Amino acid sequence: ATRRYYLGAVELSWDYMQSSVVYKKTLFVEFTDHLFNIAKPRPPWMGLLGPTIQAEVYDTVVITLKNMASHPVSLHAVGVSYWKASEGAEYDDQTSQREKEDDKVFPGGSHTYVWQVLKENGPMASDPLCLTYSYLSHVDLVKDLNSGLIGALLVCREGSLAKEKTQTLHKFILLFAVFDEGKSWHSWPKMHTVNGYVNRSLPGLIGCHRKSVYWHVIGMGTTPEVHSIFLEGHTFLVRNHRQASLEISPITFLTAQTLLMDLGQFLLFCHISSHQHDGMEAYVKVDSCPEKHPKTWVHYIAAEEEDWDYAPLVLAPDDRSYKSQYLNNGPQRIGRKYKKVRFMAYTDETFKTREAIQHESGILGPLLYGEVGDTLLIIFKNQASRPYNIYPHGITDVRPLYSRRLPKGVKHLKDFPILPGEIFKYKWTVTVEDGPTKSDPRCLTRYYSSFVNMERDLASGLIGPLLICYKRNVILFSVFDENRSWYLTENIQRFLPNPAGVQLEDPEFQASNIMHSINGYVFDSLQLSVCLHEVAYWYILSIGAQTDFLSVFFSGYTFKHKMVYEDTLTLFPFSGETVFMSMENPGLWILGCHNSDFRNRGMTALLKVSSCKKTRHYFIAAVERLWDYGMSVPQFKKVVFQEFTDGSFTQPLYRGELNEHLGLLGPYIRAEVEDNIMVTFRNQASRPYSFYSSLISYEEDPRKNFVKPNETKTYFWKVQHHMAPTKDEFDCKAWAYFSDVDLEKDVHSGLIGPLLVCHTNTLNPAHGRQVTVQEFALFFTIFDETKSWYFTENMEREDPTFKENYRFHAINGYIMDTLPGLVMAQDQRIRWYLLSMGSNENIHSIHFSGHVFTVRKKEEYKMALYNLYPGVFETVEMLPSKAGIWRVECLIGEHLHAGMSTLFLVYSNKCQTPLGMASGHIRDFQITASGQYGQWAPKLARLHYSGSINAWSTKEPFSWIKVDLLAPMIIHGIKTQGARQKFSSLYISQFIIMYSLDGKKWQTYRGNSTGTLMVFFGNVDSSGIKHNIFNPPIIARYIRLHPTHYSIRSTLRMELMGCDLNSCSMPLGMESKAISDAQITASSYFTNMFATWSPSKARLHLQGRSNAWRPQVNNPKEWLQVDFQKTMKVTGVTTQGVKSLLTSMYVKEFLISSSQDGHQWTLFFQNGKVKVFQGNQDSFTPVVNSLDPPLLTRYLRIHPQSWVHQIALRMEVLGCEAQDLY
Ligand SMILES: *[C@@H]1O[C@H](CO)[C@@H](O[C@@H]2O[C@H](CO)[C@@H](O[C@@H]3O[C@H](CO)[C@@H](O)[C@H](O)[C@@H]3O)[C@H](O)[C@H]2NC(C)=O)[C@H](O)[C@H]1NC(C)=O
Ligand SMILES: *[C@@H]1O[C@H](CO)[C@@H](O[C@@H]2O[C@H](CO)[C@@H](O[C@@H]3O[C@H](CO)[C@@H](O)[C@H](O)[C@@H]3O)[C@H](O)[C@H]2NC(C)=O)[C@H](O)[C@H]1NC(C)=O
Ligand SMILES: *[C@@H]1O[C@H](CO)[C@@H](O[C@@H]2O[C@H](CO)[C@@H](O[C@@H]3O[C@H](CO)[C@@H](O)[C@H](O)[C@@H]3O)[C@H](O)[C@H]2NC(C)=O)[C@H](O)[C@H]1NC(C)=O
Ligand SMILES: [Ca+2]
Ligand SMILES: [Cu+]
Ligand SMILES: [Zn+2]
Secondary structure: OOOOOOOOOOOOEEOOOOOOOOEEOOOOOOEOOOOOOOEOOOOOOOOOOEEEEEEOOOOOOOOOOOOOOOOOEOOEEOOOOOOOOOOOOOOOOOOOOOOOOOOOEOOOOOOOOOOOOOOOOOOOOOOOOEEEEEEEOOOOHHHHHHOOOOEEEEEEOOOOOOOOOOOOOOEEEEOOOEEEOOOOOOOOOEEEOOOOOOOOOOOOOEEOOOOOEEEEEEOOOOOOOOOOEEEOOOOEEEOOEEEOOEOOOOOOEOOEEEOOOOOEEEEEEEOOOOOOOOOOOEEEEEOOOOOOOOOEEEEEEEEEEEEEEOOOOOOOOOOOOOHHHHHOOOOOOOOOEEEEEEEEEEOOOOOOOEOOOOOOOOOOOOOEOOEOOOEEEEEEEEEOOOOEOOEEOOOOEOOEOOOOOOOOOOOOHHHOOEOOOOEEEEOEEOOHHHOOOOOOOOEEEEEEEOOOOHHHHHOOOOEEEEEEEOOOOEEEEEEEEHHHOHHHHHHHHHHOOOOOOOOOOOHHHHHOOEEEEEOOEOOOOOEOOOOOOOEEEEEEEEOOOOOOOEEEEEOOOOEEOOOOEEOEEEEOOOEEEEEEEEOOOOOOOEEEOOOOOOOOOOOOOEOOOOOOOOOOEEEEEEEEEEEOOOOOOOOEEEEEEEEOOOOOOOOOOOOOOOOOOOOOOOOOOOOEOOOEEEEEEEEOOOOOEOOEOOOOOOOOOOOOOOEOOOOEEEEEEEOOOOOOOOOOOOOOOEEEEEOOOOOOOOOOOOOOEEEEOEOOOOOOOOOOOOOOOEEOOEEEOOEEHHHOOOOOHHHOOOOOOOOHHHEEOOEOOEOOOOOOOOEEOOOOOEEOOEEEOOOHHHOEEEEEOOOOEEEEOOOEEEEOEEEEOOOOOOOOEEOOOOOEEEEEOOOOHHHHOOOOOEEEEEOOOOOOEEOOOOOOOOOHHHOEOOOOOOOOOHHHOEOOOOOOOOOEEEOOOOOOEEOOOOOOEEEEEEOOOEEEEOOEEEEEEEEEEEEEOOOOOOEOOOOOOOOOOOOOOOOOOOOOOOOEEEEEEEEEOEEEEEEEEEEOOEEEOEOEEEEOOOOOOOEOOOOOOOOOHHHEEEOOOOOOOOOOOOHHHOEOOOOOOOOOEOOOOOOOOOOEEEEOOOOEEEEEEEEEOEEOOOOEEEEOOEEEEEOOOOOOOEEOEOOOOEOOEOOOOOOOOOEEEOOOOOOOOOEEEEEEOOEEOEOOEEEEEEEEEOOOOO
């Protein structure tokens, strides 16, 4: 079936803590009937959310909006397909008027939408019972979301709604959103809610006791702002990975399930210690719906105070500011040795003998292992001037030993302080529900700490690692905030030249204490020692203040993450992950953090390894070039990689057609696994730079990587498997390369590029591409020019709000739909590469308008919105099923509105029509030349022209002929003939091509061919119709044929094959009897004998006796009718006349009326009045009448007015298909 939904934007009033400060919003809401009188019974626990739209596969959601509010809206879906008349975004998709009705519904309003849920829109084999999608009104997106325009779009797989078994309980939908009721359609507080409720006020979330439960998470909120959801009683399931936090991002779709198993009420809340999220919590009741041996670890631990040297033996002699603020004592500087309290491991309840400490574990307590089924036995004894505690994260059973019942008036063991000298015996037990689930690494990483004051307890050093594994090398990123540590005063009075030197809230004072630590140490002090070929695990944490997300990275290294290989790992605050690197690369490396404002403050450490058939070849150089992003004006000097040729970096290897989407991006540098990459890098530009790909697998024997200007480096390495994809992956995978002298200061410059590593026999012949599938590359960032190496020099053109457009939002460098190259086939796989790089603004949420896609990590998950944390280079695949112009956005307004978008062209590859050069529909004044030479005018250069003279020709040796389709078009193919004079064969044999979109900016042509330009091959005689195809098609309006080699005289007769932009040119099958004779009827059919001019015979080019429609009469009314029997979109009428028995008969002037249901008609008005269509001056030449308002309808009629001799019609409708309402 299809299931029709009724809607309405309906501006309503909202105050959060209810079903007292009231706020004004607008809110989708179902209505019962097309009358739009009654509303729909909506359950209490929804709140704002637009109704839950449940669609199967092969279904046809219809919808029917009604903007009852005081502003335009839309109905942009995500994750389903729609006929362009049902998108919902105004951008120059070069589409009609009837197809931008959907873009913005006005007040009063209406419009019906229709949605498709294709087999491609459905969910994969390892995808849930139902995908999680939304929809949002999409006029202004910032204002649309903050006002409460968002719904739940569910795409349940084929056959799945027969009320599955006993559906009874099942699922609820959570909209962890951040309505900023300030910057909305009515302009205040950034109101963190959950379905529209703040502060534990969300009524209805009810589970079953043993039955599980299914959450359809939806992120929302129009500006980065990370989030982090816990259900405190519980752990979450996504894919089949055990997760604690639903680490939701800007705009995000998840499908988590959790298994309630303990009765009660649990605080579905939002952690993130960055103070805020006022609210972002709500309650989750769970009542009871009706009808190889486990070992036992022992640990004697205690919490004893101590002196802590943050950076110890480090030479750290700097007194020239910055680094020194942290490590050197002075006038109002505690310095670097602060007093702290940590955990400490002993041997027995005597608590008199510590156990052997170790570097590579600074400040973090002992390692607590824990297999599933195993039991831990934590015996804890405080030893400090304060009451501390020890609770674990992840393990859920945690009652004290011996007895279950909790002690004094305490409700939970978390907040039961341990008085400074007593001994508590804890018993932790691990059940499978706390451990890994096949799809995650054998050990998951977890922490444990004190819970009498979650913050300051940990800011003193009360932290330690705990693993939960199935049936060493701990790294902890910790921002210890001394100014919250208890022992601060006990440190001032001991380390300051006057304990009266209070100051306190001095920014420089406080900021000189946020020590930025790895494990325990700072500033390249945590030097760890691992030999070669050791195959190591790395349990990696991020606990502390932090409140950002860290982008951790080993240097020249690569860890198997979630089954798949990666380079940068994103840890959210209070999250741990396990990564598996096979350390097969020598040298000394750094264990950094990317986020600049960190590694520049200490957070670094060193790795120090060492011990105890083809050859792909690239020539890239770093050229200083000038930019402007969107001129189609301030211009900025940037620097990019550029692919060259000779070792003498002379020829710059121009790119075209295929590589016109990089612009900023350096050149694709591809490789098959187990051959050799060699990049010969030369430095043009000012300042030195480099080329580091993290893959550069060196050879044994700090490893400089400096490239002073005019100098050249050779990187050469064998591309291994811990680089290549992985059976379950894709036929290729993307890494990245840039310069590693300043990691990011020389990237806002522009040095960036994609590096592919394809499977073992997929990189094809001498093309060195894959040709099977169109690969691309979208690099989303947010270029900050004020940070460049050239912000001085870029004074070729007082920091308040003058930044604004010193910060460009750049898909590949082109702000605001300024990105070209995105020209794609129709039905044809495409392998997009998705990156993001920079600061933590960059959690970009990329959305392929109208389009879904899929991605692979040891399984195949169908997605439709992929969030790009910086460092993560993905790789997706999609086949576009509809031809038009679409968008790649960034669904967070303030980041999209500021200009982060581009379009891509999908063209129907069965659309290939003669532009009109032969038929003449290309008029003479469109065809220009370069010295007509003489009488062989260029206005002749048409195919098949016959008349002794009949071509363009020129003695001149360097010439050219150009056209102009009047419009930008898909120039898809050119033919080529020649002429003959006397006994001479006039032909061209070797010609190139130029094209442009204004007439004064020509580009050559480079498709596939391995040269500076494609060199075509003309004819060999006076009739060799040579059909050259541009299989990398041409988008242009002005094409220009340049000959290079010629017999006798360069002389040509051509004809251009192409289609319009939105692929609407091919005939609707009049001539090829694809429209049954019965589908055509007319007012009158002249007939007697040797006749029957039946209206059935109106087909263009039709031959034979009695071969046109002819009314019995011949009056200026009359008509011919064409019931398409399906709503097509008509974009032109080709019309023609016949000659019968020395009586040429045609039709001079006709006009078109279009019905819809067969009896209600409307004449094609033009500029108010009616349009008299010209055409047909003789009795054979067809004449095409394009329509500037491309008429719709399934019915069509031709009325002939002024004719000639008699009325003889022959036609062929020029159109294409669609589907308008229902
Ligand atoms: C939701 O829960 C939050 C969490 O407590 C509530 O926050 C409290 O909100 C009130 C007003 O909405 C704040 O009052 C104001 O406090 C400031 C700072 O002291 C003071 O200068 C003002 O004159 C006013 O008294 C209150 O401080 C704040 N609690 C905090 C910040 O801890 C909130 O009220 C709840 N409801 C909503 C709708 O947010
Ligand atoms: C080594 O690098 C230096 C960098 O200054 C090169 O010197 C410069 O070379 C360029 C080559 O075209 C000369 O042309 C001019 O460049 C300036 C930019 O500096 C540009 O704005 C102009 O339009 C012009 O094309 C430039 O005069 C020259 N500058 C100096 C001070 O010598 C040098 O060529 C490199 N080494 C070799 C062997 O080429
Ligand atoms: C120059 O352009 C591309 C290089 O990017 C060449 O790739 C060809 O692209 C087409 C469609 O985009 C591919 O067609 C498909 O091929 C498979 C394999 O048989 C077939 O099963 C599909 O049904 C479809 O026909 C084509 O394979 C691919 N490669 C080749 C060698 O044709 C394109 O061919 C080049 N064009 C010219 C004129 O040289
Ligand atoms: Ca549209
Ligand atoms: Cu964004
Ligand atoms: Zn939150």
